[PDB]
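Why Crammer? Reviewers of the renewal asked for a concrete example.
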Amino acid sequence: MMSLVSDEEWVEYKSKFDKNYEAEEDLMRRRIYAESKARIEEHNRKFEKGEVTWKMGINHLADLTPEEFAQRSGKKVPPN
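Here is what the prediction returned.
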C-alpha cells in the first residue's frame, strides 16, 4: 500500500529536516512517504550486496515527491 508511512514518521523528521509539513500537505505526501521506507531498503540492501558501503537516509522528498511536488504547486489547478 501507499499509506504505510503517514505524517507520523515524518513529523519527527520535519524537525530534523527543517521542512515541516503537516497532515494537510502530508496527505498527498502520504503517498510519497510510502516510497521513503522503500528507500530505506534501497541502500541497506546495496552494501548488503558487497557492493559499497552506503546506507539509506530517507530522502527529503520521500515525503514530498512529484506526488506532492506536482500537487503542492506544480500543475495549474483551477477553483472548479
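The first helix runs from residue 7 to 17. This is the kind of structural detail the renewal will allow us to pursue systematically.
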